[PDB]
């Protein structure tokens, strides 16, 4: 069973995001900040990780680099920040894709499927 981790301080997003992917057969873990995230990372293996840029205890660029010290699992940023410099940074820190909020759950799940497809097939 696919397992995805969502790292966001916005619990409303975490909740909608969880419920929706949970409906697609995916088991979902949450994390409201870096610290909480590293724990989940040390404790589980994920197929995909959604990561916000701004967190109450650090940023997504740094956390990305840190996650890569443990896993090369696909990482997808979620954020209202839509600027070229932020994206080039997210992608170079070990990131794969970068989605803009408010998230379009449909295109999201298409990406999710495209990524696992590649990952498995």
UniProtKB/TrEMBL annotation:
<keyword id="KW-0805">Transcription regulation</keyword>
<dbReference type="GO" id="GO:0000976">
    <property type="term" value="F:transcription cis-regulatory region binding"/>
</dbReference>
<dbReference type="GO" id="GO:0006355">
    <property type="term" value="P:regulation of DNA-templated transcription"/>
</dbReference>
<keyword id="KW-0804">Transcription</keyword>
<dbReference type="GO" id="GO:0000156">
    <property type="term" value="F:phosphorelay response regulator activity"/>
</dbReference>
<comment type="function">
    <text>May play the central regulatory role in sporulation. It may be an element of the effector pathway responsible for the activation of sporulation genes in response to nutritional stress. Spo0A may act in concert with spo0H (a sigma factor) to control the expression of some genes that are critical to the sporulation process.</text>
</comment>
<dbReference type="GO" id="GO:0005829">
    <property type="term" value="C:cytosol"/>
</dbReference>
<keyword id="KW-0238">DNA-binding</keyword>
<feature type="domain" description="Response regulatory">
    <location>
        <begin position="3"/>
        <end position="116"/>
    </location>
</feature>
<dbReference type="GO" id="GO:0032993">
    <property type="term" value="C:protein-DNA complex"/>
</dbReference>
<protein>
    <recommendedName>
        <fullName>Stage 0 sporulation protein A homolog</fullName>
    </recommendedName>
</protein>
